[PDB]
Each structure stands twice: as structure tokens, then as C-alpha cells.
Structure 1
């Protein structure tokens, strides 16, 4: 009970957790498992107390009877808000943007249209819109929904890659990294800017960044924000400035999760742990850093500024929100989780 057992996924996280444990003087200790699903099970089973999960996993742990403890507060990825512990920063906005000059285009007029995605299986670029598209329709065949798309990471033979176009030489088509020209936020946005796609699924921050002189890239630079609208779920459209009222869903901050019975205590422990090892912590560079990893995002995301208070005791569905929940629930209906299945079994 006094200790808090963390669940690491992989040897790289395991190693980092071991150094944490050591430095914490054994108040934090570590269970390791091969998959995230396996950790949620350990926690469900009381053999581990906590770990930190992404949105899809919060949903799934949520359904199995786990709850969010502290939210991972971003910085912006560099830059500013404060103070970090008391207020959770909202979490970025997934938007669907289309050219203003195209007005015969709405959230309900997207079938057989052309789509530009950031990547397959990303939150803003894939998971939220396709999750919601299939809410709209009731089919799991979102793959057949757009006539053509650029969805980096999908099958290159398929319609979902038909719009990607690799790099200068056309090489590495539909690859899920920067080498694919319409990869990521910028690329998805360029895909719409050059009218290769009808709709681009990005975040609010994306059009601001590539319009009106934020970017100098030859494709971006003479771009105008005027020229782009946002597709809201009420079927209307609005300017890019109004993302807060015209988005698909919020992309959830990663969060620590726990048995409700243990939430108070793991919380209490981590607040002190980050005072020791967090961004201003007594001991960070000096002995150990909670939000730095020798590889990438081990245990927490590297751009995490602190763990922050919920205020308080939200369920998963109140943490994620109705749109995000509808989104993921739709995805998981279409491609099941063994764990979600397991959690619905009447033998647990």
C-alpha cells in the first residue's frame, strides 16, 4: 500500500523506471510487461498501481474500471503557460479544414470526397475524424469512404495512399515520415492547399502556422488564412480563428490511470516525485528527470511540463469528452481490443 508500483512497457521504460525507483528510494517501484494492454491488466489486478496512457488507452482502461489521476500537461512543445500543477492545459484541437472557395462542401457532404491525413492511427489526423465519420454513417468501412486520400502509413496499393506523392523524386510514397511530402500536419495541410485533397484533418494550430507568413516554405508563404474554413459538426463552416467552437474533438492529454481505490495515494506520491524530479525539481538533471528519456517519451512524454491536478475525480468519459469518446468507441467497435473484450467477460 505505501509503495506505488509503476508499470513499464518495454525494456527501455523498464530501465528508466528502475532508475526512478532507485532515486526515489523505493517508494516508487516497477512492474514491467510487454504491452500496454498487459499493464492495464496488472493495474486492474492490483499487481501494479499506475501508468500513464494515451487517449485510446484511457478509453480502454476507462471501460475496464480504471480512472484518470493526473494529466500530462504539455508546454506547447516549447513555450508558455503557468502554473502547471493546478491548471490542466486544454489539449489540442482536431479540425477539419477545407478551402473557402469550395462551398458545396460540408461535414455531411464528405462521402466520395478527397481527404488528406497526417498519418494512419494518429489522433487528430485519423482516429478522431474516421471515428466520427463512422459515427455519422454506422459502417466500419471508413476505409472506402473517401474516393481517394493521402493517409501516410496505409497500404500503398490502396485508395488511402492514392494522393500521397513521396519526395522530390516521388520516392517513398505514402511513407509515415517527413519524406512523404503530405506527411504530418504540414504535409496534410499542403495536400489541401494544392487542391490535391478536399478536406485536411489537422489541429487548429496547423493553418496558423502555414499561413500569412508563419512559414517561408515555397508552398506555404503566399498562403492566406482568409482562404480556409473549418468544418463544424453542426454542418456549418467557420473561419480558422474560431477553432474552439468548430472542431471535431479535443485530442486528450495523456494521463496517469489507477484503480479508483488507489487514485488518492498515487496522486499524492507523484506530486512529491515531480517536486523531486520534474521540470524544476530539486534533483532533476542532478539525479533523475521524470520527463526526459534516453530514447523517446519513456513513461511520460518528453514535452511534458508537469503532471497536473484534474479537479477532480472525473471518469474517463468526462476526461476524454463526448466527441472523443464517440470517436474511439467507434474505432474499437470496428477493431476490437482483446482487453476490452476481456473486461466485458462476466468472469473477471
Structure 2
């Protein structure tokens, strides 16, 4: 196995961008990156743990996952969102509803929900953490997926077990065996997909990140047609997300092994790839951009750079006391 930095792609389209990243890094005399192909973040986590890959960008839900045994991976570099002059290392998980109705955060029982995917931050860990006191959940031998399936009348939760929990997959738009899939094959997957599940009239509430509604809808008059649910059981316009979110959580991060993780090499690659292929840096290639019809390949599209994670910080410390306690509490 080569001594350079090997990146983990969770899908064919991701691999293609990653191939391009390699071609471009080599053309401009910078640090090399190659690509390893897997089908899910879990598989990428296992790959890095087992010394078949070195690096992948995970959502908070999977950073937590990758911190456990036998993996023990740590965040090495965080995504930086926002704008060059006002940069953010956190994001708000919100609940997005259609303007017109009058149901509040405490009146969600028997309504239809959209989620980014199972065990993700804004789409599962925050909403389900928030709603748990309504779910009437008993614990093992009952999985939490059952109580949620009783709670909402129907939902899309990509990656949910379709066998035992068909009611969490009902709402999904995937064709055949790609229904409820944890990938782009499912049109309602991730931030962008979950909002589409609401837009099409298929759902009633979308559990996503604060910036999604601004990314997908360019016209202000269209955005005036949507609202957020505040946890004080009030509705507010979408641009009032600071006063109306469900959690503030740290951004997605690249993870690597706790020991022999190639940490220096990864950061050297990311710093150097950012200066050469970050925001407005090059017409030839974009590290933080995806072709049409693809979303957030390798890194968040609206990401503007990276921020190094200080040495003595593991996954638990990265996610912060509040969210880290909350996940454990949810399980």
C-alpha cells in the first residue's frame, strides 16, 4: 500500500471527482491524493480503521460512530462554512415546514416526516433526540426505529431497515431496490433530498440544516412560503434560524486513525488543495463543487475551507459536551 494520502469515496460520482482531484493535484505540483471506493460511510470508517484508506469527511452522526471501538478515528480537519469574512465552524439543525398550517414542534404526532438519513445529525440525532419524550419509547428489546415508526404516520428515513420498519421508508421516492437507500440513488437522501421530500408535498416536516432552504431556493418569494419550527412551539420565517433552531452542532470533519493516521500529510493536502482549488481559486477544478445533478461530493458544496483540529481532541471532544451527551442519551 502506497505512502501517500488515500481518500474514501462513498459512491461512483464521488470517485470521479476524487479522480479529478488527483489529476489536478499532480498537474500543479502539490501533495498527491488517490481514491478508495466503498458504498457507505461505515465501510469507509472500517477501511480507514483497517489501513485500507486514510481519510473521509463524515457528518457528526458518523464522527460519533467512528470514534467507537474497534475503529477509534478522530477528526483532523473541520469544514468551514459561511463566507470568507464571516466564517462558521458550526451549523444549525432546523425543522422546516410549509407556511399555512399551524402545527407546532409538540404537535408532530401522526404527521409525515422527511429526514436526511439514519443516524445523521440534523436529520435524525437532533429531531429524534428532541422528540424522544413524545415517542413513548421503552428501550431494548425495542429499537428506537419502531417508536418513531409509531409516532409519525409515514416518513422517509434513508438507510432505515426496510424489512422491520417499512413505515420509515414509505415516503421515499427511490425506484425499486434503491428505495430508502443511503445514497444519491434515493432522490430524498441528504439535506437537499429531505427538503425535496417536503417541497413535492410528500412530507410535512423536513429535518435539515439552516442553509439548505437558501441553497435550493434562489427567489425570496419562494422562501416566504416556508417556515421553521422553534422549540418554544412558535413558527418563524426561515431567515430567523438563530432564534429558531433545534441544535447548534459543529461542522462535518475529515476523520483519520488515532495512531498512524497520516495527520500531517492529510492537512498538508487539504491546506494546499484549498489554496489551489478552493473558492474562486481556479476555473479548472473545484474542491468544493459538484457537477450538475450531484450534491456535496467529498465535501459540502457551500464549504469555503478547512480548519485544523488541535492535536489532543478526540471525537467526543470534537462534537462538544452537549451533542456528545445527547447521542449517548438517545441510545
Report the TM-score, using the length of structure 1 for normalisation: 0.61
* Aligned residues of 1:93 and 1:243 also touching (Cα < 8 A): no
* Structure 2 counterpart SS, 1:92: strand
Question: Deviations along 1:180-232, whole A, 9 cap, x unmatched?
Answer: xxx7437637869xxx85x654555688999xx9325xxx86x6x8xx77342
Which structure 1 residue ranges, 5 or more long, are not aligned? 76-80, 166-173, 334-348
Match of 1:53 in 2: 58
Question: Deviations along 1:145-185, whole A, 9 cap, x unmatched?
Answer: 32523538687x965578899xxxxxxxx99648xxxx743
User: In the TM superposition, what is the alpha-carbon distance from 1:260 to its structure 2 partner?
Assistant: 4.0
Name which of 63, 66, 80 aligns with 1:73.
80
* Aligned residues of 2:8 and 2:53 also touching (Cα < 8 A): no
Structure 1's 145 and 41: CA in aligned 2 closer, same or farther, altered over 3 A? same
Separation in 1, partners of 2:35, 2:213: 42
* Aligned residues of 2:228 and 2:245 also touching (Cα < 8 A): no
Q: How does 1:301-316 map to 2 (within 5 A)?
A: 301-310=300-309, 314-316=313-315
Separation in 2, partners of 1:304, 1:44: 26
Match of 2:19 in 1: 15
Match of 2:257 in 1: 259
1:214 matches 2:224: no
Q: How does 1:210-289 map to 2 (within 5 A)?
A: 214-216=220-222, 230-232=229-231, 236-238=232-234, 240=236, 243-244=241-242, 247-250=245-248, 253-260=251-258, 262-281=262-281, 284-286=282-284, 288-289=285-286
Structure 1's 38 and 102: CA in aligned 2 closer, same or farther, altered over 3 A? closer
* Aligned residues of 2:66 and 2:72 also touching (Cα < 8 A): yes
Structure 1's 12 and 279: CA in aligned 2 closer, same or farther, altered over 3 A? same
* Structure 2 counterpart SS, 1:244: coil
Structure 1's 65 and 292: CA in aligned 2 closer, same or farther, altered over 3 A? same
| The structure with more radius of gyration | 1
Structure 1's 291 and 23: CA in aligned 2 closer, same or farther, altered over 3 A? farther
Structure 1's 300 and 147: CA in aligned 2 closer, same or farther, altered over 3 A? closer
* Aligned residues of 1:21 and 1:30 also touching (Cα < 8 A): no
Structure 1's 205 and 300: CA in aligned 2 closer, same or farther, altered over 3 A? closer
Separation in 2, partners of 1:33, 1:207: 31
Match of 2:177 in 1: none
Separation in 2, partners of 1:206, 1:279: 19
Match of 1:82 in 2: 84
1:30 matches 2:40: no
Residue correspondences, number? 292
Report the TM-score, using the length of structure 2 for normalisation: 0.63
